[PDB]
């Protein structure tokens, strides 16, 4: 999984080397950032139920067809609505993981790799998720470093969708 520490270890191993001050200065950068990361992880998690439900509602307002059009890919049924907020809660849960490890590894590994195939097969529009993710960023209530680095991961997801 991609984290600052597994990146540093991989670079040294790729060159058959022991670690040097280079890789130690990466650990130092990660450990000093980890307070804001972890304080942000705790905050999102406390709000997670309410952001996910608010983000689903924000999509359903931007795109009212998703609640009125017929077909299993839409939220016009109870199952569809359940599936939708479940999905958004997965994005949010991945972003908290990313905070905990300090990098995009949980997103890449669990969510991003494959998602195009899924979206096309099940006819789910990327634009629905980019909307949900712009809500989350506008409403998570973080500030300072915590917010800058949580937004980093949210914008990474957005750019994978666009």
């Amino acid at each position: 999984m991609k984290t600052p520490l597994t990146e540093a270890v991989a670079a040294a191993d790729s060159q058959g080397r022991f670690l040097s001050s280079t890789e130690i200065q990466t650990a130092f950068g990660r450990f000093r950032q980890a307070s804001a990361s972890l304080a942000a992880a705790k905050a999102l998690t406390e709000k997670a139920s309410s952001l996910a439900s608010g983000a689903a509602n924000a999509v359903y307002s931007k795109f009212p067809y998703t609640t009125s059009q017929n077909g299993p890919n839409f939220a016009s049924t109870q199952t569809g609505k359940d599936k939708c907020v479940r999905d958004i809660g997965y994005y949010l849960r991945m972003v908290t993981y990313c905070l905990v490890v300090g990098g995009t590894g949980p997103l890449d590994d669990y969510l991003i790799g494959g998602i195009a195939e899924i979206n096309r097969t099940f006819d789910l529009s990327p634009s629905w998720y980019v909307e949900a993710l712009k809500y989350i960023k506008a409403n998570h209530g973080l500030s300072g470093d915590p917010a800058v680095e949580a937004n980093s991961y949210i914008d990474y997801a957005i750019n994978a969708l666009s």
Partner: protein
């Protein structure tokens, strides 16, 4: 490979959970020992040649049959291979100490080792004595209270000894 952080996340994802406040505090405690861990990585790295040489010197003194003609570490190519193996195992122990997880040591280093030696005719249990002599030396260099800020490294020291012990029980 995983680090100590990733490892927790990957056990949470399989259950579908967010980390608990408890889990987050425990990772904070790990970050708190950040500098101490880097001093252990720094110190063992900085003496890596000497740890290897002195370890091999004592192994061959205790076990002279490995170097007698016909011995698994007799001839230059075999001796060079043996010292190479000792350096490799130390290097991946220092990787695990850096990342605070054994993934990389098991995955990249130990996995299939014992069957390699079994196929080669290399005495795994002598390999394990070599690893143990590198362990004691490294715990002594990393624990030296000179020229460092005094504090408590005791869990870290326990965590280090386990990675050596994991290496020794793997090949033996």
């Amino acid at each position: 490979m995983l680090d100590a952080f990733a490892k927790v996340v990957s056990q949470a994802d399989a259950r579908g959970e967010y980390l608990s406040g408890s889990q987050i505090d425990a990772l904070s405690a790990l970050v708190a020992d950040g500098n101490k861990r880097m001093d252990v990585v720094n110190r063992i790295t900085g003496n890596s040649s000497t740890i290897v040489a002195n370890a091999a010197r004592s192994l061959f003194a205790e076990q002279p049959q490995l170097i007698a003609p016909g011995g698994n570490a007799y001839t230059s190519r075999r001796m060079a291979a043996c010292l190479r193996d000792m350096e490799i195992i130390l290097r991946y122990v220092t990787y695990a100490i850096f990342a605070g997880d054994a993934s990389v040591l098991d995955d990249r280093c130990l996995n299939g080792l014992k069957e390699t030696y079994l196929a080669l005719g290399t005495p795994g249990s002598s390999v394990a004595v070599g690893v143990q002599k590198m362990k004691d030396a490294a715990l002594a260099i990393a624990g030296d209270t000179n020229g460092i800020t005094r504090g408590d490294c005791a869990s870290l020291m326990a965590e280090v000894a386990s990675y050596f012990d994991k290496a020794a029980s793997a090949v033996a």
